[PDB]
């Protein structure tokens, strides 16, 4: 039985909820509206099947996935304000669903994934962020369906810190792809992908797909924000987007890729995320 | 076969598609991308087709207009220019459809769609005050537990923050005392509640369901108001209509007040005047 | 003493204050902060006073309304609610002033200010099409080098992207052939040009200068249009008016066309209808 | 004779121009409209005194100050796009006014100041950014005028990377301020300053004040983005906001302040700015 909890009744939270329902992914879906005693009741009013709206954290109990979509001026103070909000919520919600995967969609995603990790005390493999999953699934789609490289397109990933750049790396789980093909396929795909955004509806579709893989234990590879210590010579406790196999029990495997110098982009993001994290009050 | 077309791949169009899919209303749903739309293709909903080709819409039961666009007139005229490129073609592809207008300003855009399509008025409706009415009835029937009275109150007229209320009497007499307490208590719970995309998306799904499954269910929708409330101009106002496969089959009667009339008549004047400045 | 009050410390209010200061128009300028305003205090312009106290405005020659606020009616009504709290008080502080309305929608907000202040209509004007008219005259006189003809063309009516043009004849006969070429060439150069804050700020400074220095200069401003163009409703439309200390002293005559009339009359209907829905 | 050039006819550029004119700071002011053959002509149409609008870079010639307000999707690509735009402009404009101060208001300010520095070849002391000048002048104003600490308020500065945090440091050019007073005055002032933005009109007023100090050689202290190598144990070529005396010839002196650990905030910004800069194509 696949119970899923979406945390936060803003646009993002409704987008996740509608996306999940549209595909019939959840047996029960609880949407937590944390607003002062709004329009979130429309989902019940219009009787979205198996959608329960609640203000009660305990309604989340026994979820397979809990999706954090809440968001709350200088950058540090904006992050800390979101941190303050997570402190009131994560510990409770971790306790209601101790066997769940926590999936963090709130921004800035790497930092908020770390925060959720620390507040919940869950093992790292069960605390992930949306990372570059949306970027990755779009890139692969373009290459497989638009450029018609049906196998090559499954082997390219967007990784690292979301929104900062588009760092590309290639896995090799199905075929060797020569460098000349890697370059043409990704330049052509980037033409189509450079201009696309991160609007709530897009993110909610991305989240629904990850949730589908987790609850149905698909063991499908997703570029998600995952604890990056021990990868790319990162030794700090920072989350970066990495190709991970997802199932019921979270990340079962981080996929190996081949990468040059470019790990410098990753290490600079890690260093910058870590410095900021050390300035936060949990 | 329930074929449904959503016109526009903006936030509203996505909201409508997902709400419709979520409820299992459509056998086939075509979403027309006129430019997040690729993301919906990636998501791969069964029986959802994404297309830039207008003709993909052919033979729909319902065509849902969700496209949206300076001074207010120029903002409206810019929306009208988009409809001019779209409505004629879409009317011709699905000549037996109901055209449902979710685009703002709804009353004017419904009239525009009516004129451009040449459809009979009973088959061109706007989302009107269906959202407000459903919330209001819900609150009364399910929160306040007035399971019959709550079915007889409607928000009508021109969509906006001022809710003009009226009562039908299709099932029950409701005393003025009860009408007042039930509507005051419910309004207390329908305060800042707005017109967000997903809310409109769900309102749309609901109406679409009554149309494609011929439910003959009453919704307050923007309908040609000529001959109602002593209005003689060609303007669309939200009125409780029985909705089915062939559109509005019946306008429900409700009981009068002169302050309601004054609001409906002044809404009609403003809408009609503005319509006279539009280039169709 | 030229005392001038700017009402509102938003982007427009700042734009107006800086434009006025830049030109040296005001002996004293009061900017009313109704909430970047502190930044203007830090900047410390001589003879500029920033205040939250309405009475700081007492004895102004001109009071410039720059405050700004759902459906269009609700957006307008929300602006009207702000004016209701403000106009009566400000009219009473500066009973000999001209009230100049820059707030959108300008025609309606001018009428609202007129009603709330109880001022004679000749002393309540809106920014109208002064900005478009000045650009147009400038282009013709200075770019196209028609130094006399360019003074006789005006943009009139309801402000928006459609520029309704008309010609005065206070200095020169201009042949139709010249009118057409000069206005076509100039329109080519006034294309995407918009209604940004700083542009309105400069238009305001210009008008304020004609008022406080009694220039008796013609500007196309939103003025009560009753008795002009067979309009009989109480609506404000942009018309070329001689502006001075005591407001509009004269409406300039221009030469007719029935398509111009039709645009002015239909603008008047829409504006009047909408005004009937407002709560003052 | 004080000729000043504003580069860019967007909102920022008009705001700078109106602010400068409002106070009669410039004898001649040239506004460079870089738009494809708009509403910038309103300034000439309405005859703002001594304002020349032009599309010709050469009209800038012999300026005392040139103010960069131009701005042109992933973060790196957004910055590089602004970089690309600066490459077309800075070298030319440096050559037209070889004795000027280049004042950078474009975002992200520290990176765009560095870019201008490198493109122009000017000495670092004549290439500065708006930094935290707006934050600083507001903080000092509140403390001197609102809280009535007329001397103490002149001794507190916002420094470092604009928008990331509010890093405060104290100079000691006029009086000792005890720690208890430093804490109360800045907490109370922060109550009033925490919620205020960086809108174009505010920034333009800030810029006009800096321009006033430079052209009239006031030798007035401003927290501006200045090359930070050799300060706070920073050894990289990065610009951070620092209290500098400004005159005709730019930064004549960096003011000494007292600071704890908190230089960690500065070093983390420097490290992050440097990493990003190394990824740019000049």
Swiss-Prot record, chains B, C:
Q: Which domain of life is it from?
A: Eukaryota
Keyword Kinase assigned? no
Q: Which terms does the record give in the GO molecular function aspect?
A: oxidoreductase activity, acting on the CH-OH group of donors, NAD or NADP as acceptor; ubiquitin binding
GO CC aspect terms: ESCRT I complex; extracellular exosome
Function recorded in the entry: Possible negative regulator of polyubiquitination.
Q: Which family does it belong to?
A: In the N-terminal section; belongs to the ubiquitin-conjugating enzyme family. UEV subfamily. In the C-terminal section; belongs to the LDH/MDH superfamily.
Protein name as catalogued: Ubiquitin-conjugating enzyme E2 variant 3
Gene name for this UniProt entry: UEVLD
């Amino acid at each position: 039985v696949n119970k899923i909890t979406v945390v936060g009744g803003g646009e993002l939270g409704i987008a996740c909820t509608l996306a999940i329902s549209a595909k019939g992914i959840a047996d029960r879906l609880v949407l937590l509206d944390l607003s002062e005693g709004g329009a979130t009741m429309d989902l019940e009013i219009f009787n979205l099947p198996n959608v329960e709206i609640s203000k009660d954290l305990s309604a989340s109990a026994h979820s397979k996935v809990v999706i954090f979509t809440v968001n709350s001026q200088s950058y540090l103070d904006v992050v800390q304000s979101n941190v303050d909000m997570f402190r009131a919520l994560v510990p409770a919600l971790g306790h209601y669903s101790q066997h769940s995967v926590l999936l963090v969609a709130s921004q800035p995603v790497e930092i908020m994934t770390y925060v959720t990790w620390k507040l919940s005390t869950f093992p790292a493999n069960r605390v992930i962020g949306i990372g570059c999953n949306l970027d990755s699934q779009r890139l692969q789609y373009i290459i497989t369906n638009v450029l018609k490289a049906q196998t090559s397109g499954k082997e390219v990933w967007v990784i690292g810190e979301q929104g900062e750049d588009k760092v590309l790396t290639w896995s090799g789980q199905e075929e060797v792809v020569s460098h000349t093909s890697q370059v043409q396929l990704s330049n052509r795909a980037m033409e189509l992908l450079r201009v696309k955004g991160q609007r709530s509806w897009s993110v909610g579709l991305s989240v629904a797909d990850m949730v589908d893989s987790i609850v149905n234990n698909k063991k499908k590879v997703h570029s998600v924000s995952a604890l990056a210590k021990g990868y790319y010579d990162i030794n700090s406790e920072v989350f970066l987007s990495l190709p991970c196999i997802l199932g019921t029990n979270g990340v079962s495997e981080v996929i190996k890729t081949t990468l040059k110098t470019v790990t410098e982009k990753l290490q600079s993001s890690a260093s910058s995320i870590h410095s900021l994290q050390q300035q936060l009050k949990l």
